[PDB]
Amino acid sequence: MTSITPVTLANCEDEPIHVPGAIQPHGALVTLRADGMVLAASENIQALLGFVASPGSYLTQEQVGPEVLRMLEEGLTGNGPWSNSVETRIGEHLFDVIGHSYKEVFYLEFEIRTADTLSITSFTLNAQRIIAQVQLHNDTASLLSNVTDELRRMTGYDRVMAYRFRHDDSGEVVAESRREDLESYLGQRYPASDIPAQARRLYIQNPIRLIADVAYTPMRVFPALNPETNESFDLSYSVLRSVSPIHCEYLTNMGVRASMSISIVVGGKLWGLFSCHHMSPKLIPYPVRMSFQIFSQVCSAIVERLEQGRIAELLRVSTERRLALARRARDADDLFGALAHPDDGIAALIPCDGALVMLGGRTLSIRGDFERQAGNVLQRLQRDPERDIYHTDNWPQPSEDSPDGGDCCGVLAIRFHRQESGWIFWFRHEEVHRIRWGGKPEKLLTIGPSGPRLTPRGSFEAWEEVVRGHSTPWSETDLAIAEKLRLDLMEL
Amino acid sequence: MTSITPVTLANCEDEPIHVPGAIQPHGALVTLRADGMVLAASENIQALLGFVASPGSYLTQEQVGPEVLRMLEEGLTGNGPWSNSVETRIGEHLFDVIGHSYKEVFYLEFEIRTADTLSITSFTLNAQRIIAQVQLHNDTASLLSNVTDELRRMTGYDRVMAYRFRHDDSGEVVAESRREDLESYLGQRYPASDIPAQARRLYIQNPIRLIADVAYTPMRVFPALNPETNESFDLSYSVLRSVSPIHCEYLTNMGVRASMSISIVVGGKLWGLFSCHHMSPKLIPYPVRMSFQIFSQVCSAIVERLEQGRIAELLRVSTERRLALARRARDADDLFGALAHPDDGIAALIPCDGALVMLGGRTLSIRGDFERQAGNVLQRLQRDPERDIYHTDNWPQPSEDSPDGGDCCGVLAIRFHRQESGWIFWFRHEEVHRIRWGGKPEKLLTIGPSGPRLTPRGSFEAWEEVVRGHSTPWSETDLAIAEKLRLDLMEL
Numbered sequence: 001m002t003s004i005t006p007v008t009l010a011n012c013e014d015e016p017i018h019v020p021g022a023i024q025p026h027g028a029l030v031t032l033r034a035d036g037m038v039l040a041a042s043e044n045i046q047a048l049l050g051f052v053a054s055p056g057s058y059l060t061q062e063q064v065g066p067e068v069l070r071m072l073e074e075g076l077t078g079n080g081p082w083s084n085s086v087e088t089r090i091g092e093h094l095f096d097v098i099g100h101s102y103k104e105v106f107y108l109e110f111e112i113r114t115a116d117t118l119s120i121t122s123f124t125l126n127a128q129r130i131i132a133q134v135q136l137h138n139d140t141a142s143l144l145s146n147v148t149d150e151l152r153r154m155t156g157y158d159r160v161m162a163y164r165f166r167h168d169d170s171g172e173v174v175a176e177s178r179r180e181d182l183e184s185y186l187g188q189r190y191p192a193s194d195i196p197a198q199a200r201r202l203y204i205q206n207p208i209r210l211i212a213d214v215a216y217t218p219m220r221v222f223p224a225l226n227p228e229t230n231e232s233f234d235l236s237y238s239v240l241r242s243v244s245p246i247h248c249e250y251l252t253n254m255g256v257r258a259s260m261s262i263s264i265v266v267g268g269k270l271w272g273l274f275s276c277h278h279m280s281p282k283l284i285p286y287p288v289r290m291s292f293q294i295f296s297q298v299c300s301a302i303v304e305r306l307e308q309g310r311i312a313e314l315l316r317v318s319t320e321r322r323l324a325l326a327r328r329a330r331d332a333d334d335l336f337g338a339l340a341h342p343d344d345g346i347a348a349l350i351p352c353d354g355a356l357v358m359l360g361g362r363t364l365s366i367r368g369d370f371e372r373q374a375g376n377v378l379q380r381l382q383r384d385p386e387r388d389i390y391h392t393d394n395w396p397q398p399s400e401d402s403p404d405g406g407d408c409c410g411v412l413a414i415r416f417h418r419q420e421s422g423w424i425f426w427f428r429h430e431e432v433h434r435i436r437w438g439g440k441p442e443k444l445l446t447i448g449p450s451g452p453r454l455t456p457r458g459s460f461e462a463w464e465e466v467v468r469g470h471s472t473p474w475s476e477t478d479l480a481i482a483e484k485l486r487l488d489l490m491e492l
Numbered sequence: 493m494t495s496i497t498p499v500t501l502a503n504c505e506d507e508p509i510h511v512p513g514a515i516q517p518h519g520a521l522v523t524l525r526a527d528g529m530v531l532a533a534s535e536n537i538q539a540l541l542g543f544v545a546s547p548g549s550y551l552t553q554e555q556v557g558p559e560v561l562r563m564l565e566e567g568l569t570g571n572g573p574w575s576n577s578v579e580t581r582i583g584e585h586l587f588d589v590i591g592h593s594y595k596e597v598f599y600l601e602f603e604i605r606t607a608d609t610l611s612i613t614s615f616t617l618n619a620q621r622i623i624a625q626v627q628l629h630n631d632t633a634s635l636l637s638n639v640t641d642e643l644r645r646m647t648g649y650d651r652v653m654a655y656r657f658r659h660d661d662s663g664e665v666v667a668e669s670r671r672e673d674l675e676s677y678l679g680q681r682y683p684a685s686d687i688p689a690q691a692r693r694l695y696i697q698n699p700i701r702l703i704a705d706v707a708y709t710p711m712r713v714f715p716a717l718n719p720e721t722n723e724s725f726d727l728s729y730s731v732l733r734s735v736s737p738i739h740c741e742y743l744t745n746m747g748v749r750a751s752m753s754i755s756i757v758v759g760g761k762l763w764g765l766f767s768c769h770h771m772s773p774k775l776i777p778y779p780v781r782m783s784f785q786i787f788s789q790v791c792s793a794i795v796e797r798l799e800q801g802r803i804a805e806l807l808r809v810s811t812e813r814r815l816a817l818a819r820r821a822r823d824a825d826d827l828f829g830a831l832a833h834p835d836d837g838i839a840a841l842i843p844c845d846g847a848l849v850m851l852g853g854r855t856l857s858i859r860g861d862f863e864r865q866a867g868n869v870l871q872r873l874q875r876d877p878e879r880d881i882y883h884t885d886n887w888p889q890p891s892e893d894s895p896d897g898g899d900c901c902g903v904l905a906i907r908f909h910r911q912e913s914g915w916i917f918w919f920r921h922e923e924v925h926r927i928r929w930g931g932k933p934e935k936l937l938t939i940g941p942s943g944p945r946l947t948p949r950g951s952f953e954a955w956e957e958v959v960r961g962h963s964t965p966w967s968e969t970d971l972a973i974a975e976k977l978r979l980d981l982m983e984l
């Protein structure tokens with residue numbers, strides 16, 4: 001046999017999950033050349049479809065029937081990306097046949113329709129009403145909160161969570177709906193490393209991902225290498241694509257047996273994800289998944305609009321505050337009274353855990369005590385004094401050699417008056433300190449061979465270790481506001 | 493009984509089509525008060541549902557079943573607009589019960605499902621494929637044409653057209669798909685009076701309008717007036733709402749027996765409309781219509797994005813063209829040689845049928861002879877020598893008493909040099925004359941008692957009458973470009 005790489009926690013960061021060479025046993029995959037010649041098929045193809053797709057053969061009406069052949073021929077003879085489906089009866093079972101093409105290869109996926117058509121119609125209507133009602137939401141928090149409960153009410157999943165991804169791709173459960181006896185994961189954080197770059201790519205490219213059974217045994221696709229090119233078949237868009245063994249073990253530790261997740265894509269990146277988890281196997285009919293795929297596209301457009309609105313509104317309000325303060329600084333009797341004003345001062349321009357004003361030897365801390373942090377920052381800046389703007393989200397925490405210390409892990413500053421040490425500072429506390437007061441998801445469970453990290457506790461500890469000593473970073477909005485404020489203060 | 497106004501061409505522009513007091517016989521309508529008390533019901537309620545909804549009574553589980561009552565209870569107890577539907581078997585038929593509330597009145601519409609779950613699932617999948625595929629179009633013309641052909645392929649309508657409404661609400665068939673034996677209406681124009689303000693409002697508020705059989709006899713609603721307010725029930729959102737007698741006459745003259753239309757709303761105004769016509773009665777199942785309602789919302793958002801992109805691109809191109817012209821005029825030895833350039837002159841900045849350059853007593857016409865027309869415009873402007881910018885879209889056509897005259901219906905004039913009579917003019921020919929180059933959509937048909945205006949040719953003649961002597965008006969973008977050109981030439 002060829003070489004094989006064992007998937008372990010040390011190498012899973014680069015696991016080739018897009019080319020597993022196997023599919024979930026709830027369906028069968030047929031791979032076809034651009035001329036319709038069968039390149040490879042699944043080992044269970046004879047079990048599900050009752051016919052053998054011998055490589056090098058061509059499909060016939062005796063095998064897949066006329067509807068599948070007409071769909072396929074319309075695909076092979078078409079131009080550009082192809083994606084279609086048809087219903088057909090093969091043997092006794094009714095199969096949903098999904099067709100698509102990728103990297104010049106054509107795929108046919110035979111999925112048994114186990115649910116009744118009446119339920120499929122009702123479930124489609126409910127999904128379509130989500131698609132319609134989601135346009136009425138005024139804010140993304142309301143949207144995610146309402147959609148999570150409506151998605152659970154419709155699908156009946158034991159748990160539904162909405163994830164929102166932060167600047168570093170770390171996940172956060174921002175909304176939840178769950179069975180009464182289930183442990184709540186609301187507010188849990190987990191590191192970006194829990195969803196490898198390849199998985200994030202797949203979540204961005206494919207709007208819906210479904211795992212019918214985590215305890216499944218993959219069915220192989222033979223040959224594993226493409227007969228024409230010595231490379232594995234790229235199953236990136238396959239609906240039946242196998243699951244990584246590590247994610248299976250992770251979900252297994254949580255007792256999750258099935259999952260379905262709906263991606264939210266904004267600006268070409270995975271902005272959020274509705275993830276539905278079930279404690280027992282659960283299949284969602286293909287027409288309903290297609291309705292959720294349209295929901296994903298619509299909700300992504302709505303969330304993009306709502307985020308653009310929220311950003312524009314924050315820029316408007318910030319500009320109004322900035323102009324009001326820039327005027328008052330000249331109009332007021334004292335620049336400290338203006339800048340340090342509890343509501344109209346600089347502390348209201350950038351969301352911060354405190355601020356400090358320094359000018360002509362004068363100092364004043366806002367919402368805290370930051371005099372020594374500013375002093376140490378200046379002592380560091382003295383090694384590179386031409387920095388009129390300074391930005392850090394990872395100020396080094398000092399050793400126990402001093403009782404006073406840099407508890408403000410983040411510092412942002414502006415030198416508005418070089419002549420008299422005119423400095424403006426914004427401070428933020430550790431991103432762990434900003435959350436630890438809310439508790440932690442730490443629990444103990446029966447755990448598989450890979451150990452405790454494949455559990456929500458281990459995931460949260462790994463996040464805590466990643467953001468340890470780091471404050472929430474200054475976004476491009478904050479940096480823009482800071483530079484604009486300096487440009488305004490350059491006149492004063 | 494109260495008097496009833498006869499709907500005729502003299503008063504049809506004021507017809508209150510939103511309160512017809514009747515519905516189409518393919519379904520039944522029940523009106524309810526906010527407490528669930530029956531206010532009024534359609535005279536066919538017994539024929540379809542098997543029970544009588546006597547005003548003042550309450551619906552019981554024996555009449556409509558628990559599903560309808562649970563949905564209604566949720567609607568009556570919910571806060572804000574309500575809209576939901578459920579599938580239920582009432583008497584001998586399976587119904588799609590659509591519930592909604594308007595002006596504090598609750599309505600229940602029972603529609604018999606004529607198709608099985610199969611076929612409906614396939615039709616819904618096809619509609620969903622359109623919804624997904626329409627996001628791949630990069631231009632509005634390609635979108636409208638492809639959607640028109642795919643909508644015809646799915647629905648099987650004898651004809652499908654895409655109307656695009658203009659600044660004066662006039663319509664134009666910009667795309668068509670039709671049966672081999674059907675007469676083509678591509679490029680037909682019709683006046684705004686063909687769709688009164690109330691019909692436009694309803695097409696904006698309700699994304700789907702269906703007419704199952706134009707030859708139908710409306711089923712009246714009794715009582716005719718709301719017992720709580722003594723006013724007619726507002727059916728603006730009802731899907732069974734009756735059709736005006738005059739549009740039934742119009743479609744009867746066209747030989748059309750059924751119609752379905754999908755609205756395209758951009759900026760809160762009816763931007764366009766896909767209309768499907770059938771030569772025989774045709775019903776579209778409710779789940780499929782809800783799929784097309786989501787298609788209408790998605791298509792409206794896509795068309796809005798595409799039109800915004802096209803407008804921004806036109807502003808970019810116009811800016812570059814204006815700057816290029818200014819540079820060439822600065823580098824050219826003779827300003828006339830640059831301004832009269834066929835590809836980079838004033839004729840390239842604004843869509844026009846002709847232009848004229850005048851300066852220091854020099855005159856030069858572009859794309860034809862406009863010297864005497866410009867002379868007459870100056871004669872009109874000489875009455876107000878302070879007018880530096882003038883535009884008109886209804887230039888009075890001179891009589892036959894002169895061999896030459898103002899043969900231009902549109903005139904846009906700008907003065908860039910008061911001392912040197914520096915003037916720029918753009919001219920546009922009659923809109924009818926502009927269309928006549930593409931053919932004449934006129935034919936004769938059998939006509940009804942309202943006479944020839946309720947025919948496609950009658951609508952074309954009425955449009956010709958409405959735009960006679962008028963050119964396409966100068967839009968805000970054209971005026972902005974013209975003003976910027978004026979300022980740039982003043983700088984030069």
Ligand SMILES: C=CC1=C(C)/C(=C\C2=[NH+]C(=C\c3[nH]c(/C=C4\NC(=O)[C@@H](C)\C4=C/C)c(C)c3CCC(=O)O)/C(CCC(=O)O)=C2C)NC1=O
Pocket residue numbers: 009012013017171185188189190193194195196199209242243244246247250259261275276453454455456459460
């Ligand atoms: C309380 C719950 C909880 C969860 C579910 C969580 C993380 C999380 N993993 C996700 C997916 C994947 N993760 C890995 C691989 C790795 N898994 C690891 O743990 C490290 C060692 C590792 C690589 C270095 C792969 C291949 C996939 C793709 C699976 C596929 O679809 O084939 C997702 C996506 C959405 C979802 O599944 O709900 C989430 C949200 N964190 C928590 O606290």
Ligand SMILES: C=CC1=C(C)/C(=C\C2=[NH+]C(=C\c3[nH]c(/C=C4\NC(=O)[C@@H](C)\C4=C/C)c(C)c3CCC(=O)O)/C(CCC(=O)O)=C2C)NC1=O
Pocket residue numbers: 501504505509655663677680681682685686687688691701734735736738739742751753765767768945946947948951952
């Ligand atoms: C060759 C084809 C062709 C067409 C189809 C055309 C006109 C046209 N009428 C439309 C609708 C309506 N018109 C009127 C009323 C008036 N109709 C008139 O003729 C004058 C007298 C009048 C009032 C003063 C009303 C109440 C409705 C609403 C009907 C309802 O209840 O749903 C539409 C919408 C789309 C559609 O119907 O497919 C179009 C496109 N003009 C053409 O050349």
